């Protein structure tokens, strides 16, 4: 048989489906679930007793540009997965179909472009977790900004133009300093690959310079104080699929980028610089939480909430402790579950019914919308870090690592546990509490679709909170591969 025959079969089927039924969302959801199943099969066929990279493949080689390489000279883009990659890949393939189904009935103009852009962003993020050099990583790290610009501009809310320009310009600003870093690495080492880059020990005075660019990128993408102001606007004014994808995966690309680009290389610069990281992270935690306490827009509140938990994750990943790394990864996963559920509630349930996000209009949803109130309470108490959810496990271990590394900063950072509760429950109490608003008419409660999405995202976080250990078979190497202790 042929490769081209099989993908031409798929292409012809897609063309005929589009001809007869003029929509692509069913085919993209079929491909969504098919990709999820294929990745589960790869996990079935994944050896946990090897730290090596598996399922390797190379593209755009000199000898076979439109195929895979078997060469003894490798000049193309390298791909392959470690357990760390596979964790976030599982998250990505879990979330993509939910982002498609979250906007199933609320896109009534140029639907096919919306679904194409969503699936394309998701596949770019998947391939970005599959990358094994600085350049493929970069070209998949920056390739989402055109798609996000177009998606947010065409399908966004009132202030969508500003958000579109922000999500491109801020990220490009950080990523070009990342590019200077990568260029320096490539001209100095004459190699870019994530397999043997811990074998090349650069001088400290040059590590300290490369680290600056990589960390500026990580600061703009994570985000971290003082460069966190784009995230409220973008996550607020985007379509629901965009906000879900962003908060769930694109923010975690920065965590993966730390672990994959900055710790294995640049170990001595990192071990000299990390108190500055702790300064920035503690600021990012406390000031962003307090800033959340005086916001009037719901999706904006959830957007600000993402930043503090990513700061706790940064404390964990920059801790030089195995428990801290594991905690940061569990935080990434559990936040990728919980935050898109909150974004669904505040951007696809309520926004689809009332088309407004100002808190002053919302009060007393419990009376006519009780199931939604139950979901709000569950997801709020999960977001603030209640035990038996992965959020608590990750927070606990990240703060353990931060305390081990710097007891004073890591101990002061434990007011996260309080401030999270304040800014989340001050909103939950008003939404669920009181007499139902006079500015709002009655509308339907949550549907079977919305409930399906929220229930998947709640089951996942409860599984990884009740037994976090199930994620260790893909991470017991990663929790020791990036630790610099003599």
């Amino acid at each position: 048989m042929f490769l081209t025959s099989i993908l031409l079969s798929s292409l012809y089927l897609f063309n005929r489906i589009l001809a007869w039924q003029g929509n692509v969302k069913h085919f993209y959801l079929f491909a969504s679930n098919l990709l999820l199943l294929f990745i589960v099969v790869l996990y079935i066929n994944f050896n946990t007793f090897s730290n090596s990279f598996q399922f390797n493949f190379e593209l755009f080689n000199s000898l076979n540009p439109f195929g895979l390489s078997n060469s003894d000279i490798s000049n193309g883009l390298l791909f392959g997965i470690d357990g760390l990659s596979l964790t976030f890949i599982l998250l990505t393939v879990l979330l993509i179909p939910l982002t498609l189904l979250g906007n199933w009935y609320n896109i009534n103009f140029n639907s096919n472009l919306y679904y194409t852009l969503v699936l394309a962003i998701g596949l770019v993020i998947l391939l970005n977790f599959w990358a094994l050099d600085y350049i493929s990583f970069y070209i998949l790290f920056e390739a989402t900004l055109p798609l996000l610009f177009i998606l947010i501009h065409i399908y966004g809310s009132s202030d969508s133009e500003r958000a579109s320009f922000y999500v491109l310009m801020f990220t490009l600003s950080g990523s070009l300093f990342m590019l200077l870093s990568i260029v320096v690495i490539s001209i100095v080492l004459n190699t870019t690959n994530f397999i043997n880059h811990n074998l090349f020990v650069l001088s400290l005075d040059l590590q300290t310079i490369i680290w600056l660019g990589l960390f500026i990128a990580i600061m703009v993408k994570t985000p971290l104080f003082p460069i966190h102001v784009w995230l409220p606007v973008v996550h607020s004014e985007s379509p629901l699929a965009g906000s879900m994808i962003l908060a769930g995966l694109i923010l975690k690309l920065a965590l993966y980028a730390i672990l994959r680009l900055l710790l294995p290389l640049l170990c001595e610069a990192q071990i000299l610089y990390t108190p500055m990281i702790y300064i920035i992270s503690l600021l990012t935690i406390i000031l962003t939480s307090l800033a959340t306490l005086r916001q009037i827009d719901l999706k904006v509140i959830i957007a600000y909430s993402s930043i503090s938990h990513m700061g706790i994750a940064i404390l964990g990943v920059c801790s030089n402790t195995s428990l801290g790394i594991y905690g940061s990864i569990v935080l990434g996963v559990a936040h990728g579950f919980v935050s898109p559920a909150l974004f669904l509630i505040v951007g696809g349930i309520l926004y689809d019914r009332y088309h407004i996000r100002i808190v002053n209009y919302y009060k007393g949803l419990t009376t006519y919308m009780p199931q939604l109130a139950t979901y709000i309470i569950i997801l709020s108490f999960a977001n603030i870090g209640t035990p038996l959810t992965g959020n608590f496990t990750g927070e606990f271990l990240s703060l353990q690592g931060g305390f081990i590394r710097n007891p004073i900063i890591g101990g002061i950072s434990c007011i996260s546990v309080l401030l999270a509760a304040i800014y989340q429950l001050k909103l939950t109490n008003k939404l669920t509490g009181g007499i139902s608003s006079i500015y709002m008419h009655r509308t339907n409660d949550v549907t079977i679709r919305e409930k399906f999405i929220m229930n998947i995202l709640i089951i996942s976080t409860l599984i990884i909170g009740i037994c976090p250990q199930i994620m260790y078979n893909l991470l017991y190497w990663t929790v020791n591969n990036y630790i610099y202790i003599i």
């Binding site: 050896n47 390797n56 000279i73 490798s74 397999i195």
Partner: protein, 69 residues
């Protein structure tokens, strides 16, 4: 029983072959950066046929005593 992962030895060997290809490309890039910016011949850089840089000037009033080495 459904778990049929590639063994550790074969994984290590495939990764090693990949890293060997990558180091080969590295050494090729260094060699090419060194073969460039290396001084070439007058025949390779300017003129392969008339390979004498020495100029023989005019011919209409050629004075004996004008050539010099």
């Amino acid at each position: 029983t459904f778990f049929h992962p590639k063994s550790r030895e074969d994984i290590l060997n495939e990764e090693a072959k990949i890293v060997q290809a990558l180091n080969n490309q590295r050494e090729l890039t260094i060699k090419m950066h060194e073969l460039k910016r290396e001084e070439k011949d007058y025949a390779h850089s300017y003129s392969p046929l008339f390979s004498d840089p020495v100029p023989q000037g005019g011919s209409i009033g050629k004075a004996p005593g004008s050539s010099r080495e």
